[PDB]
Amino acid sequence: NTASWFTALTQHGKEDLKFPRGQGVPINTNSSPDDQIGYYRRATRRIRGGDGKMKDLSPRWYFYYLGTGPESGLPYGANKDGIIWVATEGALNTPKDHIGTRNPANNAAIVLQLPQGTTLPKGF
């Protein structure tokens, strides 16, 4: 019953998601400077293609605050395939259980917006 608070970054290229130190955290006016830390989780979807065979769709990366989402128990910097970490300078390395996850039944997803001067890899 839980989803990301933001819309996804679609991976159109061959390279995985990666942000330079300090960049990557989506803008949220309902959050404070201490909360600006989390991870992007890759979600690949498979569909029945025009030839009957299963084919992959462009991967989607969803942001979740630290201590929240499908990898709530993972600490910052944890090595896991499909998980990349982001944190703004000044955010505290503590769980963000007060923000948590979004319930789509009563909350719309916030359009993913990166701060001014955020660099994204090719195909994003």
Residue numbers in the entry: 48 to 171
Q: What's the publication's text?
A:
One central protein involved in the formation of regulatory ribonucleoprotein complexes (RNP) is the coronaviral structural protein nucleocapsid (N). N plays a major role in RNA genome replication, translation, and packaging and has further been found to interfere with host-integrated stress responses and stress granule formation. The N-NTD possesses a peculiar, hand-like three-dimensional fold, with a β-sheet palm and several flexible loops, arranged as fingers around the central β-sheet. The latter, together with the extraordinarily long basic β-hairpin finger, constitutes the positively charged primary RNA-binding surface.
All crystal structures of nat_mutants with WT-like RNA-binding (nat_mutants P67S, A119S, E136D and P151S) superimpose well with the NTD WT with RMSD values between 0.592 and 1.776 Å. Mutated residues in the above-named nat_mutants lie peripheral to the structural core, which further supports both the converging structures and the unaltered apparent RNA-binding affinities. The effects are moderate and may be neglectable in the full-viral context, which is in line with earlier findings using P80R (and A119S) variants of N testing the infectiousness of virus-like SARS-CoV-2 particles, where no significant effect was observed.
